[PDB]
Design a protein around this nucleic acid. Structure first.
Ligand SMILES: [Mg+2]
Ligand SMILES: [Mg+2]
Ligand SMILES: [Mg+2]
Ligand SMILES: [Mg+2]
Ligand SMILES: [Mg+2]
Ligand SMILES: [Mg+2]
Ligand SMILES: [Mg+2]
Ligand SMILES: [Mg+2]
Ligand SMILES: [Mg+2]
Ligand SMILES: [Mg+2]
Ligand SMILES: [Mg+2]
Ligand SMILES: [Mg+2]
Ligand SMILES: [Mg+2]
Ligand SMILES: [Mg+2]
Ligand SMILES: [Mg+2]
Ligand SMILES: [Mg+2]
Ligand SMILES: [Mg+2]
Ligand SMILES: [Mg+2]
Ligand SMILES: [Mg+2]
Ligand SMILES: [Mg+2]
Ligand SMILES: [Mg+2]
Ligand SMILES: [Mg+2]
Ligand SMILES: [Mg+2]
Ligand SMILES: [Mg+2]
Ligand SMILES: [Mg+2]
Ligand SMILES: [Mg+2]
Ligand SMILES: [Mg+2]
Ligand SMILES: [Mg+2]
Ligand SMILES: [Mg+2]
Ligand SMILES: [Mg+2]
Ligand SMILES: [Mg+2]
Ligand SMILES: [Mg+2]
Ligand SMILES: [Mg+2]
Ligand SMILES: [Mg+2]
Ligand SMILES: [Mg+2]
Ligand SMILES: [Mg+2]
Ligand SMILES: [Mg+2]
Ligand SMILES: [Mg+2]
Ligand SMILES: [Mg+2]
Ligand SMILES: [Mg+2]
Ligand SMILES: [Mg+2]
Ligand SMILES: [Mg+2]
Ligand SMILES: [Mg+2]
Ligand SMILES: [Mg+2]
Ligand SMILES: [Mg+2]
Ligand SMILES: [Mg+2]
Ligand SMILES: [Mg+2]
Ligand SMILES: [Mg+2]
Ligand SMILES: [Mg+2]
Ligand SMILES: [Mg+2]
Ligand SMILES: [Mg+2]
Ligand SMILES: [Mg+2]
Ligand SMILES: [Mg+2]
Ligand SMILES: [Mg+2]
Ligand SMILES: [Mg+2]
Ligand SMILES: [Mg+2]
Ligand SMILES: [Mg+2]
Ligand SMILES: [Mg+2]
Ligand SMILES: [Mg+2]
Ligand SMILES: [Mg+2]
Ligand SMILES: [Mg+2]
Ligand SMILES: [Mg+2]
Ligand SMILES: [Mg+2]
Ligand SMILES: [Mg+2]
Ligand SMILES: [Mg+2]
Ligand SMILES: [Mg+2]
Ligand SMILES: [Mg+2]
Ligand SMILES: [Mg+2]
Lengths: 271, 46, 94
RNA sequence: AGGACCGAACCGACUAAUGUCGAAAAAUUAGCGGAUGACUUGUGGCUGGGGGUGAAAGGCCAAUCAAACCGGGAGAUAGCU
RNA sequence: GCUCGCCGGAAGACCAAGGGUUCCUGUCCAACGUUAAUCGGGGCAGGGUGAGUCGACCCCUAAGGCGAGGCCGAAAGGCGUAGUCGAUGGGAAACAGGUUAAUAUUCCUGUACUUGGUGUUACUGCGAAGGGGGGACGGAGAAGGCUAUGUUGGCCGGGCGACGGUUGUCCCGGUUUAAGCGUGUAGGCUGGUUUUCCAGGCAAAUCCGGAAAAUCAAGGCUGAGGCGUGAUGACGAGGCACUACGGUGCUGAAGCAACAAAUGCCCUGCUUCCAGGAAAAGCCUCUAAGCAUCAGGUAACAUCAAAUCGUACCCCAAACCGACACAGGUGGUCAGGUAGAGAAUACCAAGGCGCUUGAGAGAACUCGGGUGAAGGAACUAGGCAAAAUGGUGCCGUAACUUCGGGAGAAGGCACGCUGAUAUGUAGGUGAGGUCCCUCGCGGAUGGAGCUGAAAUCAGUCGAAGAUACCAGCUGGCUGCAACUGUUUAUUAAAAACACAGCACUGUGCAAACACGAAAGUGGACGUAUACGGUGUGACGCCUGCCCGGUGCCGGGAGGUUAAU
């Protein structure tokens, strides 16, 4: 649910929260937690590679089972849970044989539904079974790229990819960004769209929100100096150059995709 | 006014200490130069 | 066990001071300047096997050395280990 | 509840005077701004010279910065004093 | 030595960091100290640092460092696995009193406590580089229960007054007591026990997790404080013997209550919020191979062991960082009185200092201040500086507005003290008594004592009652930037930068991109509701025409064109 805020004080006037009332207020199921140490954009050299990353409130990494090999064993979704690492809410599910696991949260799930995984499972939002058994035309999420590798296609907050056709050992996926990719027809899918479908309706409100999420500010190019950014410099406002990234390559329109290893799987790039 | 030298022997003996000099190869060259110059206080470590 | 060689090397010398005298007179505790590396058990076993006394326990410390100035020249006369050997009751000694 | 409000510690540095062979190689005094946060602070790590870092001033990187410091090429070169 | 003055959320009392003998006694003052110096952080000499329990080492891990092999690189070397280090974090145990010229949770007295090894007896299956639990955690807010501590009465001891009064509701001082052990409450969390099995916890499990059945309805975990004991002991106002006229020696009275009360403890709680809040061992528990009269585990008693290193002193400073005995800088902890909302501020207590040149005179001039006739910004670049305003309660409060604001708008009015309401009220607190009781650290009654606002009414004093200190100047029109913020350490705090938002664009995941000859890393243990780049900069109304030029994107007929 999206809720505005009353303008009690500037900086609260333009915020909108996303609230869920059957979510879990409490602690996450501990055996699935691991420590997560923020790197702030620095690799093992010590230099900053991707700018604008640092600060941010501490997080723990919820282990999530994307491979989903628990075949045929029906589980019941014990509860829905906030996840800080990612944008989709997770679901703690308890299997018939007492093993608990985190999963992504399909839309039609809430407190108390049942899941079954594997080629036997029925086709309901949440079940998972290879796209050699998914009906053609369906919408799935958490699609693997190689058989048994792990959920990689469309595991975001409001996404889903459609199985447009199957012609032999490869099925054509209309992906969320609009591509059509030939994915091996033995990859796992999990039906239905993902849970937190209103993550795009939120606004951050005050710079404090970005700073809590861990995104340092961005000093743009026509403010720097000529030694720093290619745009930098000029008495007053001067921008007489074609926009480039701080490393001197085009940024308005220049294509960059150069992975000729997989150019056979892209049926059609997006528009 | 916070002047520049703010002493601490942990940080000093870690940064300039004898074993920190003897670890790398360049520090070994520092020790060689000071020994050949004839320094009495070789490293900064006591 | 402790051999007699080390047992004899342990103790260096007695100590003479106002605190030394008042301790030996009141609390029945002698004071010995001992070799810098001798331990508590060594000091106790050595005062026992050497003075024919029964010692309760030894409190030891290391007096820090002094810096003196001979002419223009600066020097560090040693530190040394000073042990408070608290004898048992009734024991007298020369 | 709040990058809400008033205001001490803590953090800052707007104005004025004094000081400018100073008490001090930037401070004092009287006022001044923030003061539950994009805050402040202790300890210990990490990033380095055309390189680091930078809420961007060409600022900061040991009182040094439009390219640090030290040693060497090196007694560079000087149609100039 | 007596007065005086200054500090008192510090200029006091403990430490960490850092120095290193600066600490204490004796002697000396040539130099050092901004003066003399008989003094000193100066010179010389002697002394002084005592630990099973404090800190370190140690056990354990974070960031991170190193890293067998390994992968990679002209060489030097780079990264990294197993590992191994790394406290700023987790892990055993001690307090009171006395004593030194200088040390003390370290010595002395009293009373404790933990963890091993070893021994003797009683029962018992023990067993890990493995499984599980625990350790184990955020921000804000809210009270409740208490304590440290404080005020008053009581008790005990002393006093009865240099000048009018002071045996009385008068005056000064004290009224202290720990760890541990025992009981184990306010509060907080959780329904218990047994049976039967289950593809889960990379093997097993009697442990955890799962599913069904009975089943009594309560047990258990946890926990400040209080109360006992510790303690017919230590301490204790003072008296008196003693003087090296230092301070020593010897006895020693009362030692309770009521009320107020933390920023501390219960509380790593509880409520709530999103920004979703370390790891590892010690600990408990499970077994595997294995050993199975043994070994080992548990309980009991006795016993041995607790090594080593630090411990003086300074520590908002004359000792540390600043060339100085330098008006600067520097982390943690302790927190009395009256007034006050308060750690503000004024005055004070304990405690510490009067800042290492003085003595005169009382010109100009400079500095820091006090006051001022009449005028009141005429000064001036400019109300710069100064002056003024200033608190609580109530009354009232405009345009505009994003409907929160603007607003403490503006503007007033009341404020002291004494009596009465009311021999101090509403309130808070709560003994005794009585009653029921699953008898207790319980409950209902009950109101003594204590504490105690705020208001009304009457009087009264002053020129003035928020009397000091402290403590908004206000209003109108407009530029720019939405806003809190950040910035040129050391002449610029702004309209610059950032910003939430907006849009274009790249990126299909071995992603774009960045760092790196490379390996590898960051992006990201993310995956298009995602990330990178660039411009713009909340919000409202908006965003027009131009593809010639330049870049970008797409296209391939044709012309031109490299190596070969
Ligand atoms: Mg490195
Ligand atoms: Mg993230
Ligand atoms: Mg932006
Ligand atoms: Mg630069
Ligand atoms: Mg350029
Ligand atoms: Mg200019
Ligand atoms: Mg211009
Ligand atoms: Mg370019
Ligand atoms: Mg020997
Ligand atoms: Mg002892
Ligand atoms: Mg605020
Ligand atoms: Mg400053
Ligand atoms: Mg000031
Ligand atoms: Mg201020
Ligand atoms: Mg280089
Ligand atoms: Mg310097
Ligand atoms: Mg020359
Ligand atoms: Mg040359
Ligand atoms: Mg006070
Ligand atoms: Mg002090
Ligand atoms: Mg030290
Ligand atoms: Mg020094
Ligand atoms: Mg000396
Ligand atoms: Mg002199
Ligand atoms: Mg001088
Ligand atoms: Mg001296
Ligand atoms: Mg003892
Ligand atoms: Mg390495
Ligand atoms: Mg270790
Ligand atoms: Mg003591
Ligand atoms: Mg067992
Ligand atoms: Mg374990
Ligand atoms: Mg009397
Ligand atoms: Mg009289
Ligand atoms: Mg009295
Ligand atoms: Mg008292
Ligand atoms: Mg107990
Ligand atoms: Mg099993
Ligand atoms: Mg069970
Ligand atoms: Mg505190
Ligand atoms: Mg077996
Ligand atoms: Mg046995
Ligand atoms: Mg002392
Ligand atoms: Mg000073
Ligand atoms: Mg100094
Ligand atoms: Mg206090
Ligand atoms: Mg005073
Ligand atoms: Mg005093
Ligand atoms: Mg005068
Ligand atoms: Mg006058
Ligand atoms: Mg005046
Ligand atoms: Mg006048
Ligand atoms: Mg007048
Ligand atoms: Mg006027
Ligand atoms: Mg003014
Ligand atoms: Mg004024
Ligand atoms: Mg007023
Ligand atoms: Mg008007
Ligand atoms: Mg209104
Ligand atoms: Mg206005
Ligand atoms: Mg008003
Ligand atoms: Mg008054
Ligand atoms: Mg009255
Ligand atoms: Mg008046
Ligand atoms: Mg206009
Ligand atoms: Mg403000
Ligand atoms: Mg990663
Ligand atoms: Mg082209």
């Amino acid at each position: 649910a999206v809720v505005k805020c009353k303008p009690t004080s500037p900086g609260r006037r333009h915020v909108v929260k996303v609230v869920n009332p059957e979510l879990h207020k409490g602690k996450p199921f501990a055996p699935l937690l691991e420590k997560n140490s923020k790197s702030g954009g620095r690799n093992n050299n010590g230099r900053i590679t991707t700018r604008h990353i640092g600060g941010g409130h501490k997080q723990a990494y919820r282990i999530v089972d994307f491979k989903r090999n628990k075949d045929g064993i029906p589980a019941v979704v014990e509860r829905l849970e906030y996840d800080p690492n990612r944008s989709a809410n997770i679901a703690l599910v308890l299997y018939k044989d007492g093993e608990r696991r985190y999963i992504l949260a399909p839309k039609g799930l809430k407190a108390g539904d049942q899941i079954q995984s594997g080629v036997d499972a029925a086709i309901k939002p949440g079940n998972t079974l290879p796209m050699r058994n998914i009906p053609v035309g369906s919408t799935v999420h958490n699609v693997e790229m190689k058989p048994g590798k792990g959920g990689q296609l469309a595991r975001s907050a409001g996404t889903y990819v459609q199985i447009v056709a199957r012609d032999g050992a490869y099925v054509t996926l209309r992906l969320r960004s609009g591509e059509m990719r030939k994915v091996e027809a033995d990859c796992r899918a999990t039906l239905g769209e993902v849970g937190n479908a209103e993550h795009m309706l939120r606004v951050l409100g005050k710079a404090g929100a970005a700073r809590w999420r861990g995104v340092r500010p961005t000093v743009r190019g026509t403010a720097m100096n000529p030694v720093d950014h290619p745009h930098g410099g000029g008495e007053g406002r001067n921008f007489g150059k074609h926009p480039v990234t701080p490393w001197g390559v085009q940024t308005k329109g220049k294509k960059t995709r150069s992975n000729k290893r997989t150019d056979k799987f892209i049926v059609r790039r997006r528009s | 006014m916070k002047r520049t030298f703010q002493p601490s022997v942990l940080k000093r003996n870690r940064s300039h200490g004898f074993r920190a000099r003897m670890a790398t190869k360049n520090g070994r060259q520092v020790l060689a130069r000071r020994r050949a110059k004839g320094r009495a206080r070789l490293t900064v470590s006591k | 066990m402790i051999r007699e060689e080390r047992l004899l090397k342990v103790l260096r010398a007695p100590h003479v001071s106002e605190k030394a005298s008042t301790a030996m007179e009141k609390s029945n505790t002698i004071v010995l300047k001992v070799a810098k590396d001798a331990t508590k058990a060594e000091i106790k076993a050595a005062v026992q096997k050497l003075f024919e006394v029964e010692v309760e326990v030894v409190n030891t410390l290391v007096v820090k050395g002094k810096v003196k100035r001979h002419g223009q020249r600066i020097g560090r006369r040693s530190d040394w280990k000073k042990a408070y050997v608290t004898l048992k009751e009734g024991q007298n000694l020369d």
